[PDB]
């Protein structure tokens, strides 16, 4: 239950709501919906302040295995790129689970995401 | 005229579903004798309404529309200050309220939001109803999406046995649009329809709503897979068939093989 | 009272708005609906043309394997069209699927130089990206200013399966060896009527400024702009299909109740703290 109130947080940026769950005991790696992580919604639309959160705790910055893709790229096709920046700052390398040169290459064409490659 | 109605339905299935409203309107102008029949046989984008009194939104439909006004499932009153609008029997209205509440939870359990509306109307030896469901995706994302649910079941209560015959006929309407430079303007809408009939047992633990719910759930679940297959499946495949980014290894065989088979009919036949 | 003139315009819009590989069906539907052959004839021919026209309908002259295309740029204006490839006059029969009775057309040979070049040039580009598509370059003079119009077509009808498709591409190349500009518009339409109604209408307008040089050189330069532009247009389309199937779609409804287990109506019909 409350599944919505939980995920609905990483959406509206209710960093105050998600902060309650994690406040328990480092719990950022569960299957949000049924096959996704609580970092996709935050990155795609986490005011850029939710990702850095549930991120500094665990490290789902790569935990993704069945998703055959990391959250870093999630922001790519989002236009935010505001997170990807302060993201790599923690490592998130640049291509740990990326199809290959896609990352920013086969991603888009804007200089924002390109901020990596040429 | 019967044939006309059939042709009208076939036309709406051919013309772009993105202009169903405009087309539908024009279709009526061409045949004002099929307005009602078309206003109940042609599915169009579910419109959203507000219930000041209740302050809640309710979808519109030809099943809950009387003349030029619509009947709200919450307050049970048409938006437009009507006088003697068609209303369901006091006993029926009660069942309608429970259906709206029951489906209300089924909408937040599958859609986790959006709007839903249910309208019922007694019949000759039973009663029918329509379950509407509208869910819009994030309005802040580059790509937009809209899910319209239109279910029309027909219960056939039985004299004895309490067993009634159900005849559902949902019709999901998936809409997808995106205004990106790389894709300028891309619209991928439509809608699939599927009928379903089966006899179920009516009891205290399994009432009408319960039965109707099971059907709708199973119907939507089945349509949810077909939509993903056709939409992000067939269509896509067809698109890749039109052109290809990678140079297609020209083939002389096919062409050379066609020349033979051809000259066969041009120089023979039979 | 919707005058007859109004009804005619509506019937024409429906016919001229039929999907690729479903003109007849729509036509027959309108006829039965209009219930007035007399009025149908009024704007019957005008409709057929406009359709085949705005539908780069690829026709095959009697015997010229010129699978040319039917557009407005090739609209003679007397009932026949134009053929830059073979350079011959042919009468297209909207109704019938055949259009023979051609007529030699001695082009002016003014802007042909560019055409002939681009034409064949674009002939390979299509035979390397379009399985069953056709092209038809047009070398005409627009109010003095010269321009090279290259039209590309490609479709894959398949009714027995309920679903058709067709690719469109018009590229306008004015003139001004001062740097060369450009201006085209891509189009894509897909239909799948197998118990419902799903279509994929999409179009992209582009406007770039290319540099004019030689004849065979500028030609290859153009085919390069379209190849890159078209490739980018198709690529962006495939990407949208992924996000629309791995985000939006999953953003609409759910594949399973949050409770992760078929709903329990029995629990939704009172399960309110009951007893």
Quick structural summary:
Chain B is of the alpha+beta class. Chain B has helices spanning 2-12, 20-30, 35-38, 90-110, 208-242, 252-266; strands spanning 48-51, 56-59, 65-66, 69-70, 115-122, 127-136, 143-155, 164-178, 185-189, 192-200. The relative contact order of chain B is 0.08.
| Separation, N- and C-terminal Cα atoms of chain A | 47 Å
The CATH superfamily label of chain A reads Ankyrin repeat-containing domain
The top-level CATH class of chain A is Mainly Alpha
Q: Briefly, what CATH class of the largest domain in chain C? A: Alpha Beta
Helix content of chain C: 25-40%
- CATH topology value of chain A: Serine Threonine Protein Phosphatase 5, Tetratricopeptide repeat
Number of strand elements of chain A = 0
Residue fraction in strands of chain A: under 5%
CATH homologous superfamily (4th level) name of the largest domain in chain C: F-actin capping protein, beta subunit
Helix-strand string of chain A: HHHHHHHHH
Number of helices of chain A: 9
Largest sheet of chain C: 5 strands, antiparallel
The count of helical stretches of chain C stands at 7
What sort of overall outline of chain A do the alpha carbons produce when their principal axes are compared? globular
CATH architecture assignment name of chain A = Alpha Horseshoe
- Category from helices, strands and their pairing of chain A: mainly alpha
Order of helices and strands of chain C: HHHHEEEEEHEEEEEHH
Biggest β-sheet description of chain A: none
**Largest inter-chain contact set:** B-C, 87 and 85 residues
The helical percent of chain A reads 40-55%
Please specify the SSE layout and strand pairing:
The complex is a heterotrimer of chains A (118), B (270) and C (275).
Chain A: H1 3-7, H2 9-12, H3 15-22, H4 40-45, H5 53-56, H6 71-76, H7 82-88, H8 102-106, H9 111-114
Chain B: H1 2-12, H2 20-30, H3 35-38, E1 48-51, E2 56-59, E3 65-66, E4 69-70, H4 90-110, E5 115-122, E6 127-136, E7 143-155, E8 164-178, E9 185-189, E10 192-200, H5 208-242, H6 252-266
Antiparallel strand pairs in B: 1-2, 3-4, 5-6, 6-7, 7-8, 8-9, 8-10
Chain C: H1 4-15, H2 23-34, H3 37-42, H4 45-54, E1 57-58, E2 69-70, E3 80-81, E4 88-91, E5 103-104, H5 112-126, E6 133-142, E7 145-155, E8 164-173, E9 184-192, E10 198-206, H6 215-252, H7 265-268
Antiparallel strand pairs in C: 1-2, 3-4, 4-5, 6-7, 7-8, 8-9, 9-10
Helix pairs in contact in C: 1-2, 5-6
């Amino acid at each position: 239950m409350c599944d919505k109130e939980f995920m609905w947080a990483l959406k509206n940026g209710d960093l105050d709501e998600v902060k309650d769950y994690v406040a328990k005991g480092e719990d950022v790696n569960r299957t949000l919906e049924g096959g996704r992580k609580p970092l996709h919604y935050a990155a795609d639309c986490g005011q850029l302040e939710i990702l850095e959160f549930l991120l500094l705790k665990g490290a789902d910055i790569n935990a993704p295995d069945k998703h055959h893709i990391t959250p870093l790229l999630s922001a790519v096709y989002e236009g935010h790129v505001s997170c990807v920046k302060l993201l790599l700052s923690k490592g998130a390398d640049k291509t740990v689970k990326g199809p290959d040169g896609l990352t920013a290459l086969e991603a888009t064409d804007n200089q924002a995401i390109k901020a990596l490659l040429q | 005229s019967d044939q006309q109605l059939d042709c009208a339905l076939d036309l709406m299935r051919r013309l772009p579903p993105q202009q169903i409203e405009k087309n539908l309107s024009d279709l009526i102008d061409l045949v004002p004798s099929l307005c009602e029949d078309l206003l109940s046989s042609v599915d169009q984008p579910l419109k959203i309404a507000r219930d000041k009194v209740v302050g809640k939104d309710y979808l519109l439909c030809d099943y809950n529309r009387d003349g030029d006004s619509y009947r709200s499932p919450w307050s049970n009153k048409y938006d437009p200050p009507l006088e003697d609008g068609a209303m369901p029997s006091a006993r029926l209205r009660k069942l309608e309220v429970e259906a709206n509440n029951a489906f209300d939870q089924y909408r937040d359990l599958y859609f986790e939001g959006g709007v839903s509306s249910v309208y019922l109307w007694d019949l000759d030896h039973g009663f029918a109803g329509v379950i509407l469901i509208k869910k819009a995706g994030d309005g802040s994302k580059k790509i937009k999406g809209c899910w319209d649910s239109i279910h029309v079941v027909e219960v056939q209560e039985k004299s004895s046995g309490r067993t009634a015959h159900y005849k559902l006929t949902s019709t999901v309407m998936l809409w997808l649009q995106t205004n990106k430079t790389g894709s300028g303007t891309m619209n991928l809408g439509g809608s699939l329809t599927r009928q379903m009939e089966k006899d179920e047992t009516v009891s205290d633990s399994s009432p009408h709503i319960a039965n109707i719910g099971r059907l709708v759930e199973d119907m939507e679940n089945k349509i949810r897979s077909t939509l993903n297959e056709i939409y992000f499946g067939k269509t896509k495949d067809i698109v890749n068939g039109l052109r290809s980014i990678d140079a297609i290894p020209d083939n002389q065989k096919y062409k050379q093989l066609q020349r033979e088979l051809s000259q066969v009919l041009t120089q023979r036949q039979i | 009272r919707v005058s007859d003139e109004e009804k005619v315009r509506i019937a024409a819009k429906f016919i001229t708005h039929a999907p690729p590989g479903e003109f007849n069906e729509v036509f027959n539907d309108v006829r039965l609906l209009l219930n007035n052959d007399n009025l149908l004839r009024e704007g019957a021919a005008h409709a057929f043309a406009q359709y085949n026209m705005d539908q780069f309908t690829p026709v095959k002259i009697e015997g010229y394997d010129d699978q040319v295309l039917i557009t407005e740029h090739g609209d003679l204006g007397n009932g026949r069209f134009l053929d830059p490839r073979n350079k011959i006059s042919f009468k297209f029969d909207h109704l019938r699927k055949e259009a023979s009775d051609p007529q030699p057309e001695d082009t002016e040979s003014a802007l042909k130089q560019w055409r002939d070049a681009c034409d064949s040039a674009l002939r390979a580009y299509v035979k390397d990206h379009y399985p069953n598509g056709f092209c038809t370059v047009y070398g005409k003079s627009i109010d003095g200013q010269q321009t090279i119009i290259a039209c590309i077509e490609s479709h894959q009808f398949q009714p027995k399966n309920f679903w058709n498709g067709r690719w469109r591409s018009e590229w306008k190349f004015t003139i001004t060896p001062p740097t060369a500009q450009v201006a085209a518009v891509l189009k894509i339409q897909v239909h799948y009527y197998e118990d419902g109604n799903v279509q994929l209408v999409s179009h992209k307008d582009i406007q770039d400024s290319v540099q004019v040089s030689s004849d065979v050189q500028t030609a290859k330069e153009f085919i390069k702009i379209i190849e890159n532009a078209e490739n980018e247009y198709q690529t962006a389309i495939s990407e949208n299909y992924q996000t629309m199937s791995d985000t939006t779609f999953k953003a609409l409804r759910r594949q399973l109740p949050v409770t992760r287990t078929k709903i329990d109506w029995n629990k939704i019909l009172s399960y309110k703290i009951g007893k």
